[PDB]
Write a protein that binds this ligand. Structure first.
Ligand SMILES: O=S(=O)(O)O[C@@H]1[C@H](O[C@H]2O[C@@H]3CO[C@H]([C@H]2O)[C@H]3O[C@@H]2O[C@H](CO)[C@H](OS(=O)(=O)O)[C@H](O[C@H]3O[C@@H]4CO[C@@H]([C@H]4O[C@@H]4O[C@H](CO)[C@H](OS(=O)(=O)O)[C@H](O[C@H]5O[C@@H]6CO[C@@H]([C@H]6O)[C@H]5O)[C@H]4O)[C@H]3OS(=O)(=O)O)[C@H]2O)[C@@H](O)[C@H](O)O[C@@H]1CO
Ligand SMILES: O=S(=O)(O)O[C@@H]1[C@H](O[C@H]2O[C@@H]3CO[C@H]([C@H]2O)[C@H]3O[C@@H]2O[C@H](CO)[C@H](OS(=O)(=O)O)[C@H](O[C@H]3O[C@@H]4CO[C@@H]([C@H]4O[C@@H]4O[C@H](CO)[C@H](OS(=O)(=O)O)[C@H](O[C@H]5O[C@@H]6CO[C@@H]([C@H]6O)[C@H]5O)[C@H]4O)[C@H]3OS(=O)(=O)O)[C@H]2O)[C@@H](O)[C@H](O)O[C@@H]1CO
Ligand SMILES: O=S(=O)(O)O[C@@H]1[C@H](O[C@H]2O[C@@H]3CO[C@H]([C@H]2O)[C@H]3O[C@@H]2O[C@H](CO)[C@H](OS(=O)(=O)O)[C@H](O[C@H]3O[C@@H]4CO[C@@H]([C@H]4O[C@@H]4O[C@H](CO)[C@H](OS(=O)(=O)O)[C@H](O[C@H]5O[C@@H]6CO[C@@H]([C@H]6O)[C@H]5O)[C@H]4O)[C@H]3OS(=O)(=O)O)[C@H]2O)[C@@H](O)[C@H](O)O[C@@H]1CO
Ligand SMILES: O=S(=O)(O)O[C@@H]1[C@H](O)[C@@H](O)[C@H](O[C@@H]2[C@@H]3OC[C@H]2O[C@H](O[C@@H]2[C@@H](O)[C@H](O[C@@H]4[C@@H]5OC[C@H]4O[C@H](O)[C@@H]5O)O[C@H](CO)[C@@H]2OS(=O)(=O)O)[C@@H]3OS(=O)(=O)O)O[C@@H]1CO
Ligand SMILES: O=S(=O)(O)O[C@@H]1[C@H](O[C@H]2O[C@@H]3CO[C@@H]([C@H]3O)[C@H]2OS(=O)(=O)O)[C@@H](O)[C@H](O)O[C@@H]1CO
Ligand SMILES: NC(=[NH2+])NCCC[C@H](N)C(=O)O
Ligand SMILES: NC(=[NH2+])NCCC[C@H](N)C(=O)O
Ligand SMILES: [Ca+2]
Ligand SMILES: [Ca+2]
Ligand SMILES: [Ca+2]
Lengths: 452, 451, 451
C-alpha cells in the first residue's frame, strides 16, 4: 500500500509563529499535535528566500536558478511560467497512479500549459497569482466595479478564484475556503482505489493582513494591531489543519498519510511575523529568510515526539516523495536534492559534507548563503564573505572567517563551480528590474564569488 | 471536398494603391473583381510594420517577437532563419493531404532546413532574400561579371532565381515570371487528387522601382516618375492575378478556392506609395505602417460585394486556414491569432475586447501600437502614449488620452503583460543594429510601457 | 576489413618542435618514422587557437562557436560541457561496431552525461580537466594533504587519474603512463573481432614544464632551461609513439591502422615552444596560433614520403574518419568540415574556393583569421584587416590588402555571413571573463567585420 502525501505550505510564516517552533504568543494546537506525534526539523531550508522560486523548487526538485525562475513572476500578469520541460512532483506521482490535487496559491504560471491541470494535478481550486484578498464580501464588489468599467488588467488579488479553469464565486474567508476544499479533496479520494497527493498552499499569513474578528478574539493579550491580525490569520490555518486531520481520521486515511507542513520562506518582520532566534527575515540570505518551520507526520514511520537537527532542503521532498511512492526518477531530470529518508531514519545528516545554497538577486549584485555541516557562509550587502559556526551561533553574531580562510574560500569556489549551469532569468517581477539586470551586466558573479 | 487556398501577398503595397481600397489613380481591375465578388477588410492588420517579421507571422501564426524574429534577416546573407520548431501553415496543410507551392519572395531563411522545401512546400520557384531586380537582361550580366571575378558575397537582388533548390535562368519581367509559375502550379494541381495551398509572394511594388514601359504607358496622367513606375509595377501584379484567376476557372478550381490578397506591410511614401487616409507608412506603428489592404474571395462562402469593418489580424489566417482544411491545431503550437470564420460569418468582431499589437524596435527604444475595439493606443518617437478613437479618427489627428487615462493605462499594462514571453532576437538585419541592441540593454520596456 | 583509427593529439606542441616539421634541436625519431613512411601536412589548421574549443571541434566536426564552446571550461570546475546533442566521432564509430578508447586529457566536461564513457568511448584512462602535473610522487602527497584538510575544490592538476569513472593511483611519469595504456588498449583490441578507434590526448608539452632527467640528458647542447625541459617532454611523447607503434606491429594492427598525429594548437613561446617560421603562437589568429604539425600514416593508402601542401582543417577528421569507417553522416549533424580523402588522393585542395576560419575572443573585441586558397586574411590587435599571400609569405610580413580591396572585403563579408549562427557562449573559463563579455555587449562584430 503506497502512502498518501500532503504538502501543506504557509506563505510568509515566521520561524517563531507556530507553537512547536517556539511561539510564546500565537497558539497552534492542531499543527502542534502533528509535531508532538511526529518529527519537527530545526535546520529546514527552502531553496530561495521568497515565494515563486521557492515554490518552483518544491515542485521541480531543482534550484530555481537552474530553470530560469530566480524571480517572482510579473506582478500585473504574464504569459510565462516555470518551464514545462521540468516535470512537477505532482505529474510524476500522477503517472504512478496518484489522484492529485492542488489548492490555493500557485504563483508558477497563468497560461494553459503552465496551469495546475497541465502540471499533473487532477484537481485545482484557488487563485493563480502571488496572493489574494481574504474576504469575498470585500473583493468581489471591487472586481465587479472594475470589470463593468471595461478594465482588463485587474489586480490579481481581487480576481475570482477558480476550480479546474472555471471561475467560481467564493463565499467564505479564503483560509477557511481552502480548508473546506482540502476536506472535499480527501473525501473524493476515498472513492478512488488510488493513493492521493495534495498540495495545500495557503496564502496566510501573507499580506494583506486580514483576519476574522473571531480568530483575533482568541489573542486578547496581543496589543500590537498587526501582530494580533497576523496571529488570527495563523490561527485560521491551524483550524484548517485540524479540519483536514479530522477528515483524514474519519476516512481512515490518516495512518497511511505523510503530512508535511512548512513555510515557503521566512517571515516578514514589518508585516507581523517573528523569526526568533534567526537574524532578519523574508528575502534575506541571513537564516531568517530561508530557514523555515517544518514537520513530518506519518504514524509508525516518522518517529513521534522527535526533533531532527541535521540540514534538510525543500529540494529533498521531490526525490523523497518519489522513493516512498515507488516512482522512478530518471537521471535526465537533474534533481538537486536527495532522498533524505535513509539518512533520516538513521538520525544522520542527509547532506553530510554537501552544501545547501541560497542565491537572491538585487540591483547590480547578489546576496548568497552556503550551509555545510556546522558552517554557514554568508554574503550580504556587498560586504566580504562571512563565516559562522551556525550550530553555536544561530543568530549569526560572530564572524570567524579570519580563522578559517581556506575553508570559506573552498565553500565559495564550490558555489562558483555550482553557478555555471544557472540559466539567465526567463522573466522578472517588474519591467525595470529586468532592464536593470541587462544594464548592470548581471549576474555580477565576479563580485559574488570574490574570495579573501 | 476540402477547399484550395491561395495567399497572395504584395510587398510594400500602399493602402490606397488598389482600386477596391480607394485608389483614384492606380487601376487594378482583376484584383477589384475579386473584391467586388467577395469581401474586403477595412481594418486588416499585419503582425509587424515590415517584411521579414510580418511574413514569419503569416507562416507561423505567431507574433514574430515570440520566436526571435522581430528583425529582417541580415541583408548580405546568413545561416539563420525563422525557427524550425514553429510549424508553418504550409507544413500543417501538407500533413493533411495538401499539394503545396510557394512562389517569389521568401525572406525567412536561406539554409537547407529553413528552405521552402523543408518548411512544407512541395514546389518553390523564386528568390530567397528580401527582394530582387525585376529585369533578367539587366541583372544576369551583373551577376555573371561578379561570379567570374571570384566574388562569393553577391547582392541577393541580382542572384539567379531557383526552382526547388536548382538555379534557373529566368527570361521574363519577374512579376510576370511569378504569375506564369502561379498558372503552372495550379495546372500541375489538376492532376493531383488533392486540394492545394499556394503562397504567391510578389516582390512588387518593392524597390527597386522597375516597371515595364507597357505598364507605365497605362498611366499617362501620373506625372511623378516614381509614382508612374510604381503604378506600372502594381498594374503588372493585377495582370498576374487575372491570369491566375483565368487558370482557376479553366481548371474548375475557382469555385472551391479561397483567395486572400494582401500586403506584407504599409507602403513607403518616398518610394511611390500612397497610404491615404492613414498617417505615415512602412515601418511605423501609426496605422499606415501595419494596416493593409485585404480581401477574401470564395464563392458561396465569402459573401459577395461586402466590406468587413471589424479588426482582423494576419495571425488569424493560420488557424482560419487550418479549420477550413480540417487540420487539427495542437495547443503546444502557441498560436497568437484566432479562427475568425465563425465571427466573420455572423458579421461580428473576431477580436471583441481583445487587443491586436504592433511593436517595432529602433535605436535604444521601441515604437508600439494597440488596436482594441474602437481604440488605437499609440507610442511613437519616444513621446508619451497617445489614444485615438480610430473609428472616428482614422488619420490619428485627435489625441484623447487626457479624457481616458484609466483605459489607456489598462491597454498599455496588458501589452506589458503580453511582452514577457517575447524572446531576445536571434538575429538583426545589420551587425551594428545587434551591437546597439546589446549596448542599450534592449528591450527598454521601462520606457515603452511607462504610464 | 574496416581500418583502425588512432588520433594522437599533443598539447601546446610548437610548429618547429618535431623533426619532420623543421626542428633543428628537438629530435623525434619515432614520430619522424611515421612521417617519412606517410604524408605530412604543411597547411594543417585547428578550429581554434587553444585547447577546449579545438578539442570540441575535433570530436564534433563543428566550429566550437556553433555549439557555444568558444571558451575553455571554468578552470576550477563546472557542471557544463560540450553539448550532448552534438554526436562525437567516437560515438558514431562505436555505433558502427568500433571498439573505442580515449586516453589522457579530456577538457570537454566533468559531469556524468559529458564523461568519455557517455560520449562513445568504451575505455577511458586519464584526467578530465585542462592538464595535469606529470610526477605522481610530487602530486599525490599534495592531494592527500588537501583532501584530509576537508577541501573539496582541489586544483585539477593534482587530482587522481581515473579509469572508467573509478580513481586510480598512477605510478609513472604521466606521458609514459598514457603510452602504457595505449599499448594496453590496442592489446585488448586484438581479442575483439572489431576495428578500434583510439583518441590519445597527451598533456605534453603543456605546462607545468616537468620532464624526466633521462629525457633531458638527451639534449646536452640545449642551454636554455625551459627549452631543455620542453625538449625532454616532447622526447617522452616520441618514446610513447614508438612504444604504441611497436605494439601495433606485434599485434599485426599497424598495416590496417590510420594514425594521425597533431597538436591541439600552436606552441606557447614563453613556455619553451618554437613555431618557426610562423608568426606568434598559442591563442593567436596569426598562423602560429592555429596552424599545427600533422601527419597521416596508413600503409598502401597514405602515400609514403610525401608533403601535402593544400589546406586541411581539424574539422575534416570527423567526416573523413566516418567515410573510411563506412559510417553514415546525417545532414542534421551540421558538420563544418569535409571528407578530404577524395581530394587528398588526387593531390587537390579539399577546400578549393572555400574558407577556413579562426575566431578567438578577447576583452571587448575579437581576433580573426580567414584561409582561402593562397590567401590569409588577418584581423589582430584591433588593427585593420590585413591580407597576405600565405603561400609566398608564410611569416605574414607583407600586407597586400591595398592591391586586393574587393577580395578582402568579400572574404570578410562571407565571415560576417558565417557568424550569425554562432551561439552565445554557454560558459567562460573564468567568471570575470563572462561578466566582461556582458559588460562589453559582445560580440563586438561591428569592429571585427569592419570594411
Ligand atoms: O491595496 S495595496 O496593497 O495598498 O496596493 C496593491 C499592491 O500592493 C500590495 O501588493 C502585494 C500584496 O500585499 C503587498 C502590497 O504592497 C504586496 O506584497 C507582495 O506580494 C508579492 C506576491 O504577490 C510578493 O510576496 S511573495 O510572493 O511571498 O514573494 C512580494 O514580495 C516580493 O517583492 C519583491 C519581489 O521579490 C521580493 C521583492 O523584491 C524587491 O524588488 C524591488 C524592485 O521592484 C527592490 O529591488 S531592487 O530595486 O532591484 O533593489 C527591493 O529591494 C529594495 O527594498 C528597499 C528599497 O530599496 C532597498 C530597500 O531599502 C532595496 O533593497 C526588493 O526587495 C519579494 O519580497 S522580499 O521580502 O524581498 O523577499 C510582496 O511584497 C500594489 O503593488 C498595487 O500597485 O496596487 C494594489 C491595489 O490595486
Ligand atoms: O543598387 S542600390 O539600390 O543603389 O544599392 C543596393 C542596396 O540598396 C537597396 O537595397 C534594398 C532594395 O532597395 C533599397 C536599396 O536601398 C533597399 O530596400 C530595402 O529592402 C529590404 C529587403 O531587401 C527591406 O524591405 S522589406 O523586406 O520590405 O522590409 C528594407 O526595409 C527595411 O530596412 C531596414 C531594416 O528594417 C527596416 C529598416 O530599419 C532601419 O535600420 C537602420 C539601421 O541600419 C535604422 O535603424 S536605427 O539605426 O536603429 O535607427 C533605420 O532608422 C533610421 O532611418 C533613417 C535615418 O535616421 C532615422 C531615419 O531618418 C532613423 O529612423 C531603420 O528604419 C525596414 O525599413 S522600414 O521602412 O523601417 O520598415 C528596404 O529599405 C544596398 O543596401 C547595397 O549595399 O548595395 C546594393 C547594390 O549592390
Ligand atoms: O603552480 S602554478 O603554476 O604557479 O599555479 C597553479 C595554477 O597556474 C597554472 O595553471 C595552468 C597550468 O600551467 C599554467 C599555470 O599558470 C596554467 O596553464 C593554463 O592551462 C589551461 C588548461 O588547464 C589552459 O591551457 S589550454 O588547455 O591549452 O588552453 C591555459 O591557456 C588558456 O588560458 C586562458 C583561457 O584561454 C586562453 C587564455 O585566455 C586568457 O584569458 C584571460 C582572462 O580573461 C585574458 O583574457 S582577456 O582579458 O579577455 O584579453 C588573457 O588575455 C590577457 O592576458 C594578458 C593580460 O592582458 C592581456 C595579456 O597581456 C590579455 O590579452 C587570455 O589570454 C588560453 O591561453 S592562450 O595562450 O591565450 O590560448 C593555460 O594558460 C594556478 O592557476 C592555480 O590557482 O594554482 C596552481 C598551483 O596551486
Ligand atoms: O554607406 S555607403 O558609404 O556604402 O553608401 C553611402 C551611404 O552610406 C548610403 O546610405 C547610401 O545608400 C543609398 C540607398 O541604398 C543604396 C544607395 O542608393 C539607393 O537609391 C538608389 C537610387 O539612387 C538609384 O537611382 C538611379 C538613378 O536613377 C535611377 C537609377 O539608375 C540611374 O542610372 C540613375 O543613376 O536607384 C537604385 C535602385 O536601382 C536605388 O533606389 S532604391 O532601390 O532604393 O528605390 C538608396 O537611397 S535611398 O535610401 O535614399 O532611397 O549610399 C551612399 C553611397 O552613394
Ligand atoms: O497589503 S499591505 O502591504 O500590508 O498594506 C496595504 C497598504 O500598504 C501598501 O500601500 C502601497 C502599495 O504598496 C505599499 C505602498 O506603497 C504598501 O505599503 S508598504 O508595504 O509599507 O510599503 C496599507 O497602507 C493599507 O492600509 O493596507 C493595504 C493592504 O490592505
Ligand atoms: N550524525 C552525523 N552524521 N553527524 C555529522 C554531521 C555533520 C556535523 N554537523 C559536523 O560537525 O561535522
Ligand atoms: N592563382 C592560383 N590559384 N594559384 C594557386 C593557388 C593554390 C591553392 N592551394 C588552390 O587550391 O587554389
Ligand atoms: Ca511567501
Ligand atoms: Ca515589405
Ligand atoms: Ca593546448
Amino acid at each position: 500500500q503506497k502512502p498518501n502525501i500532503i504538502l501543506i505550505v504557509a506563505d510568509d510564516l515566521g520561524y517563531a509563529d507556530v507553537g512547536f517552533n517556539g511561539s510564546k504568543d500565537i497558539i497552534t494546537p492542531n499543527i502542534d499535535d502533528l509535531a508532538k506525534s511526529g518529527t519537527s526539523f530545526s535546520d529546514a531550508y527552502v531553496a530561495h528566500p521568497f515565494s515563486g522560486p521557492s515554490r518552483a523548487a518544491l515542485m521541480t526538485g531543482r534550484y530555481p536558478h537552474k530553470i530560469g525562475s530566480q524571480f517572482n513572476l510579473p506582478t500585473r500578469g504574464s504569459n510565462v511560467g516555470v518551464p514545462t520541460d521540468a516535470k512537477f512532483i505532482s505529474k510524476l506521482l500522477n503517472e504512478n497512479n496518484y489522484f492529485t490535487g492542488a489548492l490555493g496559491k500557485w504563483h508558477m504560471g497563468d497560461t494553459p500549459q503552465h496551469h495546475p491541470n497541465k502540471r499533473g494535478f487532477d484537481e485545482y481550486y484557488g487563485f493563480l497569482g502571488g496572493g489574494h484578498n481574504y474576504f469575498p464580501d470585500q473583493y468581489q464588489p471591487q472586481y465587479k466595479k472594475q470589470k463593468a468599467q471595461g478594465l482588463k488588467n485587474i489586480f490579481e488579488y481581487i480576481t475570482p478564484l477558480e476550480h479546474n479553469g472555471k471561475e467560481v464565486k467564493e463565499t467564505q474567508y479564503i483560509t477557511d475556503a481552502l480548508s473546506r476544499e482540502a476536506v472535499n479533496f480527501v473525501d473524493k479520494a476515498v472513492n478512488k482505489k488510488h493513493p492521493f497527493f495534495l498540495y495545500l498552499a495557503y496564502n496566510a499569513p501573507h499580506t494583506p493582513l486580514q483576519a476574522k474578528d473571531e480568530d483575533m478574539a482568541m489573542f486578547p493579550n496581543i496589543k500590537n494591531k498587526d501582530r494580533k491580525t497576523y496571529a488570527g490569520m495563523v490561527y485560521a490555518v491551524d483550524r484548517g489543519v485540524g479540519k483536514l486531520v479530522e477528515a483524514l481520521k474519519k476516512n481512515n486515511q490518516y495512518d497511511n498519510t505523510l503530512i508535511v507542513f512548512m513555510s515557503d520562506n521566512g517571515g516578514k518582520l514589518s508585516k507581523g511575523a517573528n523569526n526568533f532566534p534567526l537574524k532578519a527575515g523574508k528575502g534575506s540570505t541571513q537564516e531568517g529568510g530561508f530557514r523555515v518551520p517544518m514537520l513530518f507526520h506519518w504514524p509508525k514511520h516518522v518517529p513521534a515526539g522527535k526533533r531532527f537537527s541535521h540540514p534538510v532542503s525543500a529540494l529533498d521532498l521531490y526525490p523523497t516523495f518519489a522513493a516512498l511512492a515507488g516512482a522512478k526518477v530518471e537521471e535526465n531530470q537533474h534533481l538537486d536534492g536527495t532522498n533524505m529518508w535513509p539518512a533520516f531514519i538513521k538520525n544522520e545528516n542527509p547532506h553530510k559534507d554537501e552544501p545547501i545554497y541560497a542565491l537572491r538577486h538585487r540591483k547590480g549584485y547578489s546576496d548568497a548563503a552556503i550551509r555545510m555541516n556546522q558552517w554557514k557562509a554568508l554574503k550580504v550587502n556587498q560586504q566580504p564573505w562571512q563565516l559562522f559556526n551556525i550550530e553555536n551561533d544561530i543568530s549569526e553574531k560572530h564572524d570567524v572567517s579570519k580563522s578559517n580562510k581556506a575553508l570559506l574560500t573552498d565553500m565559495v569556489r564550490e558555489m562558483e563551480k555550482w553557478s555555471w549551469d544557472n540559466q539567465q532569468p526567463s522573466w522578472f517581477h517588474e519591467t525595470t528590474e529586468g532592464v536593470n539586470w541587462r544594464l548592470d551586466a548581471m549576474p555580477r558573479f565576479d563580485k559574488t564569488f570574490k574570495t579573501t
